[PDB]
Amino acid sequence: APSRNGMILKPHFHKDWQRRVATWFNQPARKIRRRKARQARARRIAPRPASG
Amino acid sequence: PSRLRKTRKLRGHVSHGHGRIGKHRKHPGGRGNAGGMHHHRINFDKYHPGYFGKVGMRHYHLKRNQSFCPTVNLDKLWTLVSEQTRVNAAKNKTGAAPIIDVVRSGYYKVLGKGKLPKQPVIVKAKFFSRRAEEKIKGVGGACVLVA
Amino acid sequence: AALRPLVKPKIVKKRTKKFIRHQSDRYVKIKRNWRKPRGIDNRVRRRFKGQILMPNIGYGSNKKTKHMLPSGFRKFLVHNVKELEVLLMCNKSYCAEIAHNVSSKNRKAIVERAAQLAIRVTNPNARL
RNA sequence: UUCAAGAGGGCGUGAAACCGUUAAGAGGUAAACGGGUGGGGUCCGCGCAGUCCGCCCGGAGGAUUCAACCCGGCGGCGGGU
RNA sequence: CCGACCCGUCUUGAAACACGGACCAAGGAGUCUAACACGUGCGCGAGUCGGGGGCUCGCACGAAAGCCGCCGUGGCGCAA
RNA sequence: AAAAUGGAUGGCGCUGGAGCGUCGGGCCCAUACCCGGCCGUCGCCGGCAGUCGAGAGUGGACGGGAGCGGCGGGGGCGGCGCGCGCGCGCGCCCGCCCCCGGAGCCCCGCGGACGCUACGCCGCGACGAGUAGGAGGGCCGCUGCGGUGAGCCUUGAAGCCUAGGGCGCGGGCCCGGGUGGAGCCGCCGCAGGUGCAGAUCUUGGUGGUAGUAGCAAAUAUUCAAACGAGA
Ligand SMILES: [Mg+2]
Ligand SMILES: [Mg+2]
Ligand SMILES: [Mg+2]
Ligand SMILES: [Mg+2]
Ligand SMILES: [Mg+2]
Ligand SMILES: [Mg+2]
Ligand SMILES: [Mg+2]
Ligand SMILES: [Mg+2]
Ligand SMILES: [Mg+2]
Ligand SMILES: [Mg+2]
Ligand SMILES: [Mg+2]
Ligand SMILES: [Mg+2]
Ligand SMILES: [Mg+2]
Ligand SMILES: [Mg+2]
Ligand SMILES: [Mg+2]
Ligand SMILES: [Mg+2]
Ligand SMILES: [Mg+2]
Ligand SMILES: [Mg+2]
Ligand SMILES: [Mg+2]
Ligand SMILES: [Mg+2]
Ligand SMILES: [Mg+2]
Ligand SMILES: [Mg+2]
Ligand SMILES: [Mg+2]
Ligand SMILES: [Mg+2]
Ligand SMILES: [Mg+2]
Ligand SMILES: [Mg+2]
Ligand SMILES: [Mg+2]
């Protein structure tokens, strides 16, 4: 039921959007895992450039 | 902040702000944008005209990178370069006439909205407009095309 | 003997009783604390004769004497000597009252000093 | 016995409804209620006078340092030729 | 002594021969996200935003804080 | 001109009215009107960071000549105007003409309220019904986080009871006494599973009913002795 002079909108929520939500709470640990992998590779390839 | 709301002020008040003759029942008009032809015809003829129908041709697989032409006017042209340039021109009287690339600073077509001060500038751009080409020659400059 | 305050104007109170809630004489889930009635058929709201009276702002009390004791003094609550010495200069308008949680051995100290500085105490003999 | 059984084996504290007893008071228009007064009890404070306190001036009594003014040191405020 | 019919709710209209209600304690009912419109408050200003990622802290705090040829790939805006 | 429970000028009752009609003086009383006090809101382009007054644009710093006048103008009684100063006083016309680090009583142009938490203090004048509903102020309250009270406490915290003393229009709160046995609160900000009389509400418990209804289908018990506190 609309009213005085707003927008018309079409939101995409008529499915079951709620079993399938995704939290970005593991954002830092994801960063931390990478460094320790990114360091260690460059230690494995010792003098070779780290970038590649 | 719950403590700044108006549910913290309708305690005691029996109906929580929604009447006694008519009540906050579930979905009493429809559910969504239903009824543009039936029993909401008036909101959509009044505040949203052009909604129902169909018009125009169809372009099926449209790529918005082919159609790309960033625009600029003349007033906002001497700001692509620094201040050494515009001042060292009109000076030493050789016919300096500097060069201004627009495709460097992220612009392709040139437009003739404004005016510009009297120095004999040169311009390089892919496209031009009619009036823009005139104003430049009117001040004593030139226009140049590139690929 | 007793410390005289500065002035002692007469005091006048437009109402002396309290305002009880309605239908609290019948029942025990219902209390004496004022809650306003909001029904449609109700007659305290509609103000018939011979019924409960509702509090408005006309019963409001004069401002020269508001929060004023029968002795002319106004009240102030403490917990130690440190916040008592702030009353030295208003020793003829305001009085002191010691909290309920203070120990016996410390009340003696506070009284002993208030008596020096001429700061009246409205409960000088409690625990002993 | 234990500080404590007014902590006694489903024993921390221990509300209300509902009951038993004791103290007071009352009783033929069911009870309860609002405003206004009266009477009686329970407690608070009299004081077993409550005569409240403070400035300056006058009087009679006694008393011991300083200040008034000078000198020495110390500290601070202000100044503008 | 005078006054004075039981509360809630529907209703043009309730003391009702209109429904609910023996009594007490505890629980109990206008929320969270996503998008929009406007009003207010703060900051920068034809510009303004790092939210994704990377450089520094082992993370006691702190899964924070600071920083970036990323410094603008890009989005909203400056032209219909 | 006749109705069904006994029956209503409101009732008792009234006939030189306490009846019917026209009229007088006196009188009674509503939250209305008038006078006053107390509370809140609204309006004053209100007022006060420190000096002038209730009639109509005010103030000094400033040179060459100096007084008896000014202000030689409406039976209008006019903002402008005239006898509470106009040249007063002190030394010797001539001169002085300090003057409030304090004159002298209601304007002091030297700085200031006992008031000045300016989100404050003061003054005037008018108004106040209220459902659904909209807004504001809440030093009304409940649980927890960050800072802060050189906070409270086994010489007794929370909680609970109270013919006790008191405050606020109210929400609610502070003291006093008893019990009890270990933690709790006030201020500035933050946040929320935040305030019940009900919903044939949910869970538990308790009453009147009530020492009541009842312990009635199928023929039937009696006498003595024994164990045993006890039939
Ligand atoms: Mg709208
Ligand atoms: Mg309402
Ligand atoms: Mg509403
Ligand atoms: Mg409703
Ligand atoms: Mg309807
Ligand atoms: Mg009161
Ligand atoms: Mg009604
Ligand atoms: Mg004990
Ligand atoms: Mg115990
Ligand atoms: Mg027990
Ligand atoms: Mg009893
Ligand atoms: Mg209605
Ligand atoms: Mg009907
Ligand atoms: Mg009703
Ligand atoms: Mg009926
Ligand atoms: Mg129904
Ligand atoms: Mg029933
Ligand atoms: Mg509850
Ligand atoms: Mg905005
Ligand atoms: Mg009103
Ligand atoms: Mg313990
Ligand atoms: Mg919570
Ligand atoms: Mg809730
Ligand atoms: Mg309940
Ligand atoms: Mg209710
Ligand atoms: Mg029987
Ligand atoms: Mg039988």
Side-chain angles (χ1 to χ4, degrees), chain B residues 1-3 6 8-11 15 17-20:
Chain B
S2 297
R3 66 186 188 280
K6 62 178 283 186
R8 301 303 316 159
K9 294 291 184 75
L10 303 171
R11 298 303 194 196
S15 293
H18 287 283
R20 294 190 166 192

Coordinates of all heavy atoms in Angstrom, one line a residue, chain B residues 1-3 6 8-11 15 17-20, chain F residues 132-138 141 190-192 194-195:
Chain B
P1 N 19.6 3.4 19.4 CA 19.2 3.8 20.7 C 17.7 3.7 21.0 O 16.9 4.5 20.6 CB 19.6 5.3 20.8 CG 20.6 5.4 19.8 CD 20.3 4.5 18.7
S2 N 17.4 2.6 21.7 CA 16.0 2.3 22.1 C 15.4 3.4 22.9 O 14.2 3.7 22.9 CB 16.0 1.0 22.8 OG 16.4 0.0 21.9
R3 N 16.3 4.1 23.7 CA 15.8 5.0 24.7 C 15.4 6.4 24.1 O 15.0 7.3 24.8 CB 16.9 5.2 25.8 CG 18.1 5.8 25.3 CD 19.2 5.8 26.4 NE 20.3 6.6 26.1 CZ 21.3 6.1 25.3 NH1 21.3 4.9 24.7 NH2 22.3 6.9 25.0
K6 N 10.0 6.1 20.3 CA 8.6 6.3 20.7 C 7.8 5.1 20.9 O 6.6 5.0 20.9 CB 7.9 7.2 19.7 CG 7.8 6.6 18.3 CD 7.0 7.4 17.4 CE 5.6 7.4 17.7 NZ 4.9 8.1 16.6
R8 N 9.2 3.6 23.8 CA 9.4 4.0 25.2 C 8.5 5.0 25.7 O 8.6 5.3 26.9 CB 10.9 4.4 25.3 CG 11.9 3.4 24.8 CD 11.8 2.1 25.5 NE 11.6 2.4 26.9 CZ 11.1 1.6 27.8 NH1 10.8 0.4 27.5 NH2 11.0 2.0 29.0
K9 N 7.6 5.5 24.9 CA 6.6 6.5 25.3 C 5.2 6.1 25.1 O 4.3 6.9 25.6 CB 6.8 7.8 24.5 CG 8.1 8.5 24.7 CD 8.2 9.1 26.0 CE 9.5 9.8 26.3 NZ 9.4 11.1 25.6
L10 N 4.9 5.0 24.5 CA 3.6 4.5 24.3 C 3.3 3.3 25.3 O 2.5 2.4 24.9 CB 3.4 4.1 22.9 CG 3.6 5.1 21.8 CD1 3.6 4.5 20.5 CD2 2.6 6.2 21.9
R11 N 3.9 3.3 26.4 CA 3.6 2.3 27.5 C 2.5 2.9 28.3 O 2.7 4.1 28.8 CB 4.8 2.0 28.3 CG 6.0 1.3 27.6 CD 5.6 0.1 27.0 NE 6.7 -0.8 26.6 CZ 6.5 -1.8 25.7 NH1 5.4 -2.1 25.1 NH2 7.6 -2.5 25.4
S15 N -2.9 1.1 22.6 CA -3.0 0.6 21.2 C -1.7 0.8 20.5 O -1.5 0.5 19.3 CB -4.1 1.4 20.5 OG -5.3 1.0 21.0
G17 N -0.3 3.3 19.2 CA -0.3 4.3 18.2 C -1.0 4.0 16.9 O -0.6 4.7 15.9
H18 N -1.9 3.1 16.9 CA -2.4 2.6 15.6 C -4.0 2.5 15.6 O -4.5 1.8 14.8 CB -1.8 1.2 15.3 CG -0.4 1.3 14.9 ND1 -0.1 1.7 13.6 CD2 0.8 1.0 15.5 CE1 1.2 1.6 13.5 NE2 1.8 1.3 14.6
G19 N -4.6 3.2 16.5 CA -6.1 3.3 16.5 C -6.9 2.3 17.3 O -6.3 1.4 17.8
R20 N -8.2 2.6 17.3 CA -9.1 1.6 17.9 C -10.2 1.2 16.9 O -10.7 0.1 17.0 CB -9.8 2.3 19.1 CG -8.9 2.5 20.2 CD -9.5 2.9 21.4 NE -8.6 2.7 22.5 CZ -9.0 2.7 23.8 NH1 -10.2 2.9 24.1 NH2 -8.1 2.6 24.7
Chain F
rA132 P -7.0 8.3 23.9 OP1 -6.7 6.9 24.4 OP2 -6.1 9.4 24.2 O5' -7.0 8.2 22.3 C5' -7.8 7.2 21.7 C4' -7.9 7.2 20.2 O4' -8.6 8.4 19.8 C3' -6.6 7.4 19.4 O3' -5.8 6.2 19.4 C2' -7.0 7.9 18.1 O2' -7.5 6.8 17.3 C1' -8.2 8.8 18.5 N9 -7.9 10.2 18.5 C8 -7.9 11.0 19.6 N7 -7.7 12.2 19.4 C5 -7.5 12.3 18.1 C6 -7.1 13.3 17.3 N6 -7.0 14.5 17.7 N1 -7.0 13.1 15.9 C2 -7.2 11.9 15.5 N3 -7.5 10.8 16.2 C4 -7.6 11.1 17.5
rG133 P -4.3 6.1 19.9 OP1 -3.7 4.9 19.2 OP2 -4.2 6.3 21.3 O5' -3.7 7.4 19.1 C5' -3.5 7.4 17.7 C4' -3.3 8.7 17.1 O4' -4.2 9.7 17.7 C3' -1.9 9.4 17.4 O3' -0.9 8.9 16.6 C2' -2.2 10.9 17.1 O2' -2.2 11.1 15.8 C1' -3.7 11.0 17.6 N9 -3.8 11.6 18.9 C8 -4.1 11.0 20.1 N7 -4.1 11.9 21.1 C5 -3.8 13.1 20.5 C6 -3.6 14.3 21.1 O6 -3.8 14.6 22.3 N1 -3.3 15.3 20.2 C2 -3.1 15.0 18.9 N2 -2.8 16.1 18.2 N3 -3.3 13.9 18.3 C4 -3.6 12.9 19.2
rG134 P 0.6 8.9 17.1 OP1 1.4 8.1 16.1 OP2 0.7 8.5 18.5 O5' 1.0 10.4 17.0 C5' 1.5 11.0 15.8 C4' 1.9 12.4 15.9 O4' 0.8 13.2 16.4 C3' 3.0 12.7 16.9 O3' 4.3 12.4 16.4 C2' 2.8 14.2 17.2 O2' 3.2 15.0 16.1 C1' 1.3 14.2 17.2 N9 0.8 14.0 18.6 C8 0.4 12.8 19.1 N7 0.0 12.9 20.4 C5 0.3 14.2 20.7 C6 0.2 14.9 21.9 O6 -0.3 14.5 23.0 N1 0.6 16.2 21.8 C2 1.0 16.8 20.6 N2 1.4 18.0 20.7 N3 1.2 16.1 19.5 C4 0.8 14.9 19.6
rA135 P 5.4 11.9 17.4 OP1 6.5 11.4 16.6 OP2 4.8 11.0 18.4 O5' 5.9 13.2 18.2 C5' 6.5 14.2 17.4 C4' 6.5 15.5 18.2 O4' 5.2 15.8 18.8 C3' 7.4 15.5 19.4 O3' 8.8 15.6 19.1 C2' 6.9 16.7 20.2 O2' 7.3 17.9 19.6 C1' 5.4 16.6 20.0 N9 4.7 15.8 21.0 C8 4.3 14.5 21.0 N7 3.8 14.1 22.1 C5 3.8 15.2 22.9 C6 3.4 15.3 24.2 N6 2.8 14.3 24.9 N1 3.6 16.5 24.8 C2 4.2 17.4 24.1 N3 4.6 17.4 22.9 C4 4.4 16.2 22.3
rG136 P 9.9 14.9 20.1 OP1 11.2 15.1 19.4 OP2 9.4 13.6 20.4 O5' 9.9 15.8 21.4 C5' 10.4 17.2 21.3 C4' 10.0 18.0 22.5 O4' 8.6 17.7 22.8 C3' 10.7 17.7 23.8 O3' 12.0 18.3 23.9 C2' 9.7 18.2 24.9 O2' 9.7 19.6 25.0 C1' 8.4 17.8 24.2 N9 7.8 16.6 24.7 C8 7.7 15.4 24.0 N7 7.1 14.5 24.7 C5 6.8 15.1 25.9 C6 6.2 14.6 27.1 O6 5.7 13.5 27.3 N1 6.1 15.6 28.0 C2 6.6 16.8 27.9 N2 6.5 17.6 29.0 N3 7.2 17.3 26.9 C4 7.2 16.4 25.9
rG137 P 13.2 17.6 24.6 OP1 14.4 18.4 24.4 OP2 13.2 16.2 24.3 O5' 12.8 17.7 26.2 C5' 12.6 19.0 26.8 C4' 12.1 18.8 28.2 O4' 10.8 18.3 28.3 C3' 13.0 17.9 29.1 O3' 14.2 18.5 29.5 C2' 12.0 17.6 30.2 O2' 12.0 18.6 31.2 C1' 10.6 17.6 29.5 N9 10.2 16.2 29.1 C8 10.4 15.7 27.9 N7 9.9 14.5 27.8 C5 9.3 14.3 29.0 C6 8.6 13.2 29.5 O6 8.3 12.2 28.9 N1 8.1 13.4 30.8 C2 8.3 14.5 31.5 N2 7.8 14.5 32.7 N3 9.0 15.5 31.1 C4 9.4 15.4 29.9
rG138 P 15.3 17.6 30.2 OP1 16.3 18.5 30.8 OP2 15.7 16.5 29.2 O5' 14.5 16.8 31.4 C5' 14.6 15.4 31.5 C4' 13.7 14.9 32.6 O4' 12.4 14.7 32.0 C3' 14.1 13.6 33.2 O3' 15.1 13.7 34.2 C2' 12.8 13.1 33.8 O2' 12.4 13.8 35.0 C1' 11.8 13.6 32.7 N9 11.6 12.5 31.7 C8 12.1 12.4 30.4 N7 11.7 11.3 29.8 C5 10.9 10.7 30.7 C6 10.2 9.5 30.6 O6 10.2 8.7 29.7 N1 9.5 9.2 31.8 C2 9.5 10.0 32.9 N2 8.8 9.6 33.9 N3 10.2 11.1 33.0 C4 10.9 11.4 31.9
rG141 P 15.4 7.9 39.5 OP1 15.9 7.8 40.9 OP2 16.2 8.6 38.4 O5' 15.0 6.5 39.0 C5' 14.4 5.6 39.9 C4' 13.6 4.5 39.2 O4' 13.1 4.9 37.9 C3' 14.5 3.2 38.8 O3' 14.7 2.4 39.9 C2' 13.6 2.6 37.7 O2' 12.6 1.8 38.3 C1' 13.0 3.8 37.0 N9 13.5 4.2 35.7 C8 14.1 5.3 35.3 N7 14.5 5.3 34.1 C5 14.1 4.0 33.6 C6 14.2 3.4 32.4 O6 14.7 3.9 31.3 N1 13.6 2.2 32.4 C2 13.1 1.6 33.5 N2 12.6 0.3 33.2 N3 13.0 2.1 34.6 C4 13.5 3.4 34.6
rC190 P 25.6 9.2 24.8 OP1 25.6 9.5 23.4 OP2 24.4 9.3 25.6 O5' 26.2 7.8 25.0 C5' 27.1 7.2 24.0 C4' 27.3 5.8 24.2 O4' 27.6 5.4 25.6 C3' 26.2 4.9 23.8 O3' 26.0 4.7 22.5 C2' 26.6 3.6 24.6 O2' 27.5 2.9 23.8 C1' 27.2 4.1 25.8 N1 26.4 4.1 27.0 C2 26.3 3.0 27.8 O2 26.9 1.9 27.5 N3 25.6 3.0 28.9 C4 24.9 4.1 29.3 N4 24.2 4.1 30.4 C5 25.0 5.3 28.5 C6 25.8 5.2 27.4
rA191 P 24.6 4.6 21.8 OP1 24.7 4.5 20.4 OP2 23.7 5.6 22.5 O5' 24.1 3.1 22.4 C5' 24.8 2.0 22.0 C4' 24.4 0.8 22.8 O4' 24.7 0.9 24.2 C3' 23.0 0.4 22.8 O3' 22.5 -0.2 21.6 C2' 22.9 -0.6 24.0 O2' 23.4 -1.9 23.6 C1' 23.9 0.0 24.9 N9 23.3 0.7 26.0 C8 23.0 2.1 26.2 N7 22.5 2.4 27.3 C5 22.3 1.1 27.9 C6 21.8 0.7 29.2 N6 21.3 1.6 30.0 N1 21.8 -0.6 29.5 C2 22.3 -1.4 28.6 N3 22.8 -1.2 27.4 C4 22.8 0.1 27.2
rG192 P 20.9 -0.2 21.4 OP1 20.6 -0.7 20.0 OP2 20.3 1.0 21.8 O5' 20.4 -1.3 22.4 C5' 20.8 -2.7 22.2 C4' 20.5 -3.5 23.4 O4' 20.6 -2.7 24.6 C3' 19.2 -4.2 23.5 O3' 19.3 -5.5 24.2 C2' 18.4 -3.2 24.4 O2' 17.3 -3.8 25.1 C1' 19.4 -2.8 25.4 N9 19.2 -1.5 26.1 C8 19.3 -0.3 25.6 N7 18.9 0.6 26.5 C5 18.6 -0.1 27.6 C6 18.1 0.3 28.8 O6 17.9 1.5 29.2 N1 17.9 -0.7 29.7 C2 18.0 -2.0 29.3 N2 17.7 -2.9 30.2 N3 18.4 -2.5 28.2 C4 18.7 -1.4 27.4
rU194 P 13.2 -6.1 25.7 OP1 11.8 -6.6 25.7 OP2 13.7 -5.3 24.6 O5' 13.3 -5.1 27.0 C5' 13.5 -5.7 28.3 C4' 13.2 -4.7 29.4 O4' 14.3 -3.8 29.5 C3' 12.0 -3.8 29.2 O3' 10.8 -4.4 29.6 C2' 12.4 -2.6 30.1 O2' 12.1 -3.0 31.5 C1' 13.9 -2.5 29.9 N1 14.2 -1.5 28.9 C2 14.2 -0.2 29.2 O2 13.9 0.3 30.3 N3 14.5 0.6 28.2 C4 14.9 0.3 26.9 O4 15.2 1.1 26.1 C5 14.9 -1.1 26.7 C6 14.6 -1.9 27.7
rG195 P 9.4 -3.6 29.5 OP1 8.4 -4.7 29.2 OP2 9.6 -2.5 28.5 O5' 9.2 -3.0 30.9 C5' 9.1 -3.9 32.1 C4' 8.7 -3.1 33.3 O4' 9.4 -1.9 33.3 C3' 7.2 -2.8 33.4 O3' 6.8 -2.9 34.8 C2' 7.1 -1.3 33.0 O2' 6.1 -0.6 33.5 C1' 8.5 -0.8 33.5 N9 9.0 0.3 32.8 C8 9.4 0.4 31.5 N7 9.8 1.5 31.1 C5 9.7 2.3 32.2 C6 10.0 3.7 32.3 O6 10.5 4.5 31.5 N1 9.7 4.1 33.6 C2 9.2 3.3 34.6 N2 9.1 4.0 35.7 N3 8.9 2.1 34.5 C4 9.2 1.6 33.2

